[PDB]
Amino acid sequence: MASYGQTCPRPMCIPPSYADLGKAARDIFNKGFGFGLVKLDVKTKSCSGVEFSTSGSSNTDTGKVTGTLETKYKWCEYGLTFTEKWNTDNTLGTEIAIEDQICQGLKLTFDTTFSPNTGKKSGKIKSSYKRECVNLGCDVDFDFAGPAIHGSAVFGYEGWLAGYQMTFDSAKSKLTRNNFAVGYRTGDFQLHTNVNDGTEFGGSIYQKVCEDLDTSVNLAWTSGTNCTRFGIAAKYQLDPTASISAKVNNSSLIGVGYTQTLRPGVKLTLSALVDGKSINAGGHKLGLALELEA
Amino acid sequence: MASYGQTCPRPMCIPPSYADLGKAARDIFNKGFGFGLVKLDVKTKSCSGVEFSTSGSSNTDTGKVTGTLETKYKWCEYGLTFTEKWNTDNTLGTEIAIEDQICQGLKLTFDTTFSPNTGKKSGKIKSSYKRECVNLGCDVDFDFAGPAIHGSAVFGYEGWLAGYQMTFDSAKSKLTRNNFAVGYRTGDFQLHTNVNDGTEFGGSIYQKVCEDLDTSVNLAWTSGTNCTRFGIAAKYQLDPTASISAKVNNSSLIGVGYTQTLRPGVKLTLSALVDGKSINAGGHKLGLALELEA
Amino acid sequence: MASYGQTCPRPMCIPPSYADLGKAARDIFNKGFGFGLVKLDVKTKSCSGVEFSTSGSSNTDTGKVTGTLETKYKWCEYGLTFTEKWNTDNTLGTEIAIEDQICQGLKLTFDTTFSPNTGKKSGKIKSSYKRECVNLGCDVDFDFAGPAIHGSAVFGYEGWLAGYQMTFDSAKSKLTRNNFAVGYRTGDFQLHTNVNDGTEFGGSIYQKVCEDLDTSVNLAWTSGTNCTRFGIAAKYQLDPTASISAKVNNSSLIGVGYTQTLRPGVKLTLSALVDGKSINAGGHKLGLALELEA
Amino acid sequence: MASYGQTCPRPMCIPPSYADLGKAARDIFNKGFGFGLVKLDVKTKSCSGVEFSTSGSSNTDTGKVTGTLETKYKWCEYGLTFTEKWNTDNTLGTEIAIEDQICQGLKLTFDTTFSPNTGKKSGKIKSSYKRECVNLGCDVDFDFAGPAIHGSAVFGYEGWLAGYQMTFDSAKSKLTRNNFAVGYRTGDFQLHTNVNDGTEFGGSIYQKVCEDLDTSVNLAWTSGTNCTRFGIAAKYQLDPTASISAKVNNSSLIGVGYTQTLRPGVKLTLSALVDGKSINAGGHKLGLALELEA
Amino acid sequence: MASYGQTCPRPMCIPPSYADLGKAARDIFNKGFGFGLVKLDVKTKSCSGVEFSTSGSSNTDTGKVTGTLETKYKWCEYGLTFTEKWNTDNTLGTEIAIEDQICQGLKLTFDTTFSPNTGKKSGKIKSSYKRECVNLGCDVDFDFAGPAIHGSAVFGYEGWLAGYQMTFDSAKSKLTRNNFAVGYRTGDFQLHTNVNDGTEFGGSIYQKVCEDLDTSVNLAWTSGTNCTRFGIAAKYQLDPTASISAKVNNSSLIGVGYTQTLRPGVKLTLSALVDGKSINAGGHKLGLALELEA
Amino acid sequence: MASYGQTCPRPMCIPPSYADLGKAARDIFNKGFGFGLVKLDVKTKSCSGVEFSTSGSSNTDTGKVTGTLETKYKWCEYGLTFTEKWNTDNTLGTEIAIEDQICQGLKLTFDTTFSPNTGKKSGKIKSSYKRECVNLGCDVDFDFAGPAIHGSAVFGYEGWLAGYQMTFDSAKSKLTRNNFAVGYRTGDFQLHTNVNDGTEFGGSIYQKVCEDLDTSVNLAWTSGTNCTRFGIAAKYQLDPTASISAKVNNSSLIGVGYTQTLRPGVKLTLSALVDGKSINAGGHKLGLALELEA
């Protein structure tokens, strides 16, 4: 038996990171929609252990066309991942990730970025620990007149979750953000509630309804006022190579979308947003995306 | 077989004193850090049965430089220890300890102190009894318009602990403090919860994670309010002659430290505290300590 | 038979890199001389697969004494070399080289450097491919408001060589340097001619004369003028543990030097430069170096 | 046959360092006497490769009691010695020595010292080369507004010795001290003469007289005057575990001393100095020392 | 072989003390004559290690009869001599001598005297060192408003002698007397010349003439004048138990004397002085002495 | 049967001298304590019949360091003791004692002292007669404008004692002191009462309590007043090489002390005095003494 420097079970006795709380509900509301943009994603791999990914994007509301290119090298025998990246704003950088090299359940990542537009150099060091019933870590952001420290932890028991996230500014030695959350998760549904700085509140519901149907509800409100926001969304698997999705915001905003697999490895997504009830006499938006993986 | 005036097993079937409850977790949070101070510890011994110890200390937040010098004589054949002490505030004194002389598991200590700064004389008499599953005792503080009586006891069973601590003022014939605690201990972990006077509550978790890694969690809260405090700490053995430690407080205070053995008998410790997120724009503190044992 | 991702013969059917063109002639003019400096080179190895190297240096014309220390780890079973480095200007760094891991004849190197004097971080990624009759590659320099791209290639046939070297500045998207070279090589002699940016021209001759005698000639000139420079040098093996060298520059500068093996593994070098014809009534320089390898 | 980076014979075809010239005569005059002080030397070793040494000292003419403690680690397989040190003035430090690691006959030592009394940090780098008929080296002292360079060399032939020592101040770029010496050595006797800066002159004679008798003569004088100083000393082995010594200074100062081995590993030394002819009506001094080695 | 704290040969490779220079010539002129006095010397010894000596004396020119009594104890096993003394002027005292106890050739003596006539107490400490070719020492006289220091040394080579004697007054810190001498000695003759304070000069000749005949010459003169003094003396062994002596002074003073052994252990001496040429019509003097040793 | 000039039995049918009345009680109160002083006692003997004793002493309340040296010669075959003495105040002297030489039970002592500090000479003649049931004698003190006569006698019967002591001044022919005493003695206890000049009264009780325990009581009072003084003391043998003692004075003065034999012939004594009840806020005193007998 190999020795251990830390112990953990297989998922899902290990909780989500703070950032992942509510992810399933969020994916129903976010994935499948691309309103206002045209996106192009080309992914390829080589047997040498290198993956490539290029992502193009055109924003209808700015007229700007942008994109990012990444190359990733996977040292499977070491637990090391090396990434090279470039984008259209001439920002370039390198990322190095370490997994289970120090102790089991430990992930360490170094992110260094440079931008010749100004000559600015900056970066981040991330650390994350996964163990039975706990998911904890911290990102430290190194920049001019920084660093900033972003700590977090989630813990749980018998499907119940709770946790926090805090951001500190070391140039002031002050806390600038303090978020908290609670919830419950199982295979069929997830329930989440949270607060940001004691002022912004909200939550979400994720629910499996049928084998082909995933639904969710988002809630939000602001302390000191009577303003509340909400919405409902769903994703329906039409067939093995097709799906539809839609969502309705309390502000009468209705999103729709459709994804179709054209060929295994090839997926096409179309979507649109309508401003009710003034349609088509308002801010109608459309989107298109094509993804190809080799 | 020698006769007995009291009986006890070898540790650890004998519980910790009330004061020692949670010690392992506390050491992770306290040892290895010296923020704000420079400390110098010189220890020597002689084959005549005398040990000497001198401890220097400089506090960055006051500008004061202080220190203490002690001489200890060990009468190994009698179970008696005699200590002479002096410090920079001109306080001088004598301590006499008696171990297993009266009955097995019994420790008696006499502590007499004098300060020419005022001419004040005061002292303490301590008594502590160790037996199977019980650790009980009392310190009596003799001073002007005293004495005060500080009693305590811890008991346990199959790794479970419980106990109390009480302070009485004999000049009033009243109880002034009443502390309680419960917990569990084993080789791999310790769990402790306590209360002071029914108002201050808290606890701690000690956990061995890996052979080279010791971690802990501290909790605290105050009755009548919603104020809670907490923090997480760890100590990692980098190599046989080096270690690192760190701790994070809920108030965004991050402590770091490093200890290195320079030579067997010689240890160097460096540490610092950063006030997140305003760093370096806040109350940054550093520490340094060197210890030499002959 | 192992598969191949690239093919090459044994040297010397594989040409030198652009940087190595003319190396043999250059070594006669450079090696064996240390005018103006005192140098100390200590090299050691351990059976654990680690090599150490420390190099001290004192420059008579500045009064500065400097040096560098390196540690190298050779993963012979992987084709990987890991280097740690530090120097007197407080520059520190890490280098990782990969050889024949991707495909045969391919060398990849990652060079990361940090200097706390300013907090600056920078580095290089190098790639070099060796194949029958071709030696090609590129160094990319990543820095503030960079990167710079330094490409090169040498090719040949039946002893004949030709190649180029180009430097580009990606922050401008311009070529900044374009060097070209031609030549011929065999066991007994080498002939090289080159040009830098169409303005600086030069070349060299390497010739074996006798078993104990290596000689060479350097030539240079600048476009737009009548200024030419040249010199002649030689190295003579006096005996198995001793050698002498000398060189004469067209500007009447005469270099001399002597190397002696004191013990296998131990070499002592002395040298001097005289400013003719005003000697000793001019800028006379001396040098000394001792190298020990364990 | 192992390779060599330098060559040397066994002693004594390798001369003493400049500092060691006249050492045998000096030991007769210095060793065995401790006038005015009480000294205590405890030395111990452990099979783990660590040696410990503690030295106490009481000076009758100041009333001060002081001392030093050192720990030494011997990496016999590497040629490396690591020393940790502390003393009563709160000065602490580390020394690292390297022997025959670079090349044969080469010794390199790094000495770093810190004193919290002021917070001052300083140190030295030493280099010494031993070869047939030559002993050369240099100590560089790194301090505030330094460094100072202390160079030296001794050479010889057929028992004859000669050499020099020079100190330079790099903050001035000037020589501050220039010492020279000549002499002769054999098994039975040694003759030494020297000069410091052209002003202070002196010398010594060492002579074996009988198997149990070692004698010596010291001479000194100052340029520009008629002032001369001298003295004669001897050491006599009374028996295998006892010896006596004495010395007479031209200023009528007579030193006496006696050493006795009490047990192998245990040595006791007593000594005294009398101011002739006014005895006992003058500055009579006594000394005592005990040394124990385990 | 016993150890040595000092070394010396047997006499006569060790010179006489300053006070002993010329002693042989002086004995011819002094011994055997007792003009003007009657003397009685009784010496006894006991097997217990105690010697006694009583000396009576009557001076014809004063009419006073005096005497001294001494008791001496010889601690042969220690090298210690203890003497008790009393005389007719009521002066009493104690003397302690130490020989070869400290180091070989070293003699130390303590002389304490008391006189109830006045109640005065005073004394001397003497130190004398005998070594090959050197005889050195010092007497320190401790009295009211003293001490006085009387230093001396004699050295020689191949029969040649030279030396000095100086007296200092420590209450003034001045030299009060400075004597010098030179000479030659062998078995057959001795030659001595001296000076006291640069003013008084003189010398003597000792010569063996025949087996039964010892002769000598005394010389003296004073600086600043033409005054010289001299005389010639001789001692003749008449038979094994009888001898005659005589001396003539330049001032026409002729001394004669005769000694006879009456019985072994018993000696009778008669003598007279005649004032030439006015005899018997001048200051004629006679003497008588009897000595008995048991 | 030898003739007798006086007759007496063996002790204790012969009473103590007046000065020895109450000695056992006094020793409990005096011996074992040295408050305020450091004392050093070195005693040696030689087989030649000479004993030496040197006693050093440092008084904390004056800062003066003093001492005495004595040499004693024992003429065992004669009944004669001869003592030579010197001390730090430059007082010197001789003592001669005669025992049983005149008649049995008779002791005669001559004590002569001189001090060069003034030139003063003085002394004493003592005479003491021991017989069945009587102990009588007289000391005569001879000094300037003296002598003084100090007579005494003690007599007894069946354990009962009585006696007197008187001092007369012969320069006045008057009695100056007249002391009287009565008491009882046995092996287990002693009772004593006395009066000095009819004004000072007191007494003591000595009692053996246990084999290892000796106790006593002191009483005193002054005629004409109501002032009384008293105290209680004890000595306890802790073991064959250790003892403790203590005493309490009516004026709240508590003395403590401890003696330990370190080695046969070597004894170490520590002691202290505390001023009750103001401790430690009063005239606390400590003492130390070491005695070595060879």
From Swiss-Prot, chains A, B, C, D, E, F:
NAD(+) binds at residues 253-255, 271-275. Ubiquitinated by PRKN during mitophagy, leading to its degradation and enhancement of mitophagy. Deubiquitinated by USP30. One of its GO terms (molecular function) is cholesterol binding. The modification N6-acetyllysine is found at residues 31, 120, 277. It catalyses: chloride(in) = chloride(out); K(+)(in) = K(+)(out); a 1,2-diacyl-sn-glycero-3-phospho-L-serine(in) = a 1,2-diacyl-sn-glycero-3-phospho-L-serine(out); a 1,2-diacyl-sn-glycero-3-phosphocholine(in) = a 1,2-diacyl-sn-glycero-3-phosphocholine(out). GO terms for cellular component: membrane; mitochondrial outer membrane; mitochondrion; pore complex; sperm midpiece. The record marks 85 as: Involved in ceramide and phosphatidylcholine binding. InterPro entries: Porin_dom_sf, Porin_Euk, Porin_Euk/Tom40. The modification N-acetylalanine is found at residue 2. The modification N6-succinyllysine is found at residue 31. It is found in: Mitochondrion outer membrane; Membrane. ATP binds at residues 23, 31. Coiled coil: none annotated. The modification Phosphotyrosine is found at residue 78. GO terms for biological process: lipid transport; mitochondrial outer membrane permeabilization; monoatomic anion transport. This is Non-selective voltage-gated ion channel VDAC2. It comes from Sus scrofa. The lineage of its organism: Eukaryota, Metazoa, Chordata, Craniata, Vertebrata. The gene is VDAC2.
